[PDB]
């Protein structure tokens, strides 16, 4: 007893067992299935012509025969489109990145299949750097929209949790490599399933992502000092890290190259910082800081021009 969804690009079919799993109050797998079908129809205009006669909202999510008919209608449309491509028509171009709406659906799908008990994420020690909170898809999308990233960039999420910031950026951008590093056992374990589910689903949709790695580790380790130094774009949700960890992070950031960037939920230097004789050791001497469009996040850019100009002025 299963439901199967053929891949538009001919990857292995997505197979669901029946009954379908319960996710939470607001989401179940039957509606994920319907939304997947709707999204593939967005992905492939010709699929709409084949599917346009069926009213999706009219099926019965609680009935197996009803959902199996829906899946079979979709699979037959996929076959028909595949025959169209065998003829004069040109197949869908591979290597494309997903549209933002599709990517939001993919990550929700990856998350719901991956994090089985989301309440375990709340089991952290309070008032410690392990306090867990998730940056929303929208904030990450706004960051991707507000900062340039190219194949010359290396992206790191420090304290990557279950890894969904890394996946989103890897799907949306050209960075040479994307990484995230998570110390705590519970999010790091989930991130292994997230990694697996993401590669499977992206292949099933026929969408491309840049290269990425989700690692278990401690970003304060001796090995991570050099890796931070060599990173062009750092994302860190430091909201709960506290002064000692933020101070350790400032020391690492101080080895970054000119033009290196840090996006954080709490600023590492004041926005108004004015360099003078008293503050010369502050990290504000080496970086510009601006608030991203407002929950506020901050973009820091390594600029030693600030410190260099203060010394030239003393002469
Ligand atoms: N020294 C350290 N090394 C690796 N991860 C750390 C760390 N200190 C704290 N963390 C992790 O940082 C995470 C912050 S919650 C942020 C999760 C994710 N990046 C997001 O923004 O959605 C927590 O999961 C915590 O375990």
For residues 260 and 234, what is the distance between their CA atoms, to the nearest angstrom?
Answer: 8
The two domains 1-122 and 137-315 share their CATH topology (first three levels equal)? no
- According to DSSP H, which parts of 161-207 are helical? 164-172, 185-205
Chain breaks in the chain (C to N over 2.5 A) after: 294
Our mutation pick for probing the ligand 1 site, out of 133, 137, 142, 182, counting the most ligand atoms within 8 A of Cβ, is 182
The token duo for 246 is 């933020």
Resolution of the solved structure (Å): 2.3
DSSP label at 237?
-
Our mutation pick for probing the ligand 1 site, out of 183, 190, 191, 247, counting the most ligand atoms within 8 A of Cβ, is 183
- Ligand 1 atom 2: residue of nearest CA: 218
Q: Measured in angstroms, how far is the CA atom of residue 277 from the centroid of ligand 1?
A: 35
Sign of CA dihedral 23, 25, 27, 28: positive
Report which ligand 1 atom has the smallest distance to the Cα of 184. Answer: 26
Q: Measured in angstroms, how far is the CA atom of residue 139 from the centroid of ligand 1?
A: 17
Give strand pairing partners of 4: 15
- Contact residues of ligand 1, CB 6 A cut-off: 129-130, 132-135, 157, 159-161, 165, 181-184, 187, 218-220, 237
Say whether domain 137-315 belongs to CATH 3.40.50.1360: no
DSSP label at 286?
T
Q: Measured in angstroms, how far is the CA atom of residue 195 from the centroid of ligand 1?
A: 17
For residues 206 and 10, what is the distance between their CA atoms, to the nearest angstrom?
Answer: 9
Burial of 13 (0-12, 13-18, 19+ CB in 10 A): middle
Q: What is the CATH number of domain 1-122?
A: 1.10.260.60
From residue 212, how far is each of 19, 252, 295 by CA, in Å? 34, 22, 27
Do 147 and 235 touch, CB atoms closer than 8 A? no
Q: Measured in angstroms, how far is the CA atom of residue 238 from the centroid of ligand 1?
A: 8
Q: Tell me the domain boundaries of the chain.
A: 1-122, 137-315
């Amino acid at each position: 007893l299963e439901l199967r969804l053929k891949s538009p690009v001919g990857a292995e079919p997505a197979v669901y067992p029946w009954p379908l799993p319960v996710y939470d109050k607001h989401h179940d797998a039957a509606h994920e299935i319907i939304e997947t079908i709707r999204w593939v129809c967005e992905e492939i205009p010709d699929l709409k012509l084949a599917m346009e006669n069926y009213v999706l909202i009219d099926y019965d999510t609680k009935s197996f025969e009803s959902m199996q008919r829906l899946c079979d209608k979709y699979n037959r449309a996929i076959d028909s489109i595949h025959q169209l491509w065998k003829g004069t028509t040109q197949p869908m171009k591979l290597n494309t990145r997903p549209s933002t709406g599709l990517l939001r659906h993919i990550l929700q799908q990856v998350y719901n299949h991956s994090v089985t008990d989301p309440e375990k994420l709340n089991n952290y020690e309070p008032f410690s750097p392990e306090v867990y909170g998730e940056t929303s898809f929208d904030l990450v999308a706004q960051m991707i929209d507000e900062i340039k990233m190219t194949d010359d960039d290396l992206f790191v999420d420090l304290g990557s949790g279950v890894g969904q910031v890394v996946l989103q950026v890897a799907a949306a951008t050209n960075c040479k490599h994307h990484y995230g590093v998570e110390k705590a056992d519970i999010p790091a374990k989930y991130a292994e399933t997230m990694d697996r589910e993401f590669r499977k689903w992206m292949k099933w949709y026929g969408k491309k992502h840049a290269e990425y790695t989700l690692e278990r580790g401690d970003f304060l380790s001796e090995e991570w000092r050099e890796r931070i130094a060599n990173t062009s774009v750092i994302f860190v949700n430091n909201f709960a890290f506290g002064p000692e960890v933020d101070h350790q992070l400032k020391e690492r950031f101080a080895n970054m190259k000119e033009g290196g960037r840090i996006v954080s939920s709490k600023p590492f230097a004041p926005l108004n910082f004015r360099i003078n004789s008293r503050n010369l050791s502050d990290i504000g001497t080496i970086m510009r800081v601006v608030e991203l469009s407002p929950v506020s996040y901050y973009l820091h850019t390594i600029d030693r021009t600030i410190l260099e100009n203060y010394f030239s002025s003393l002469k």
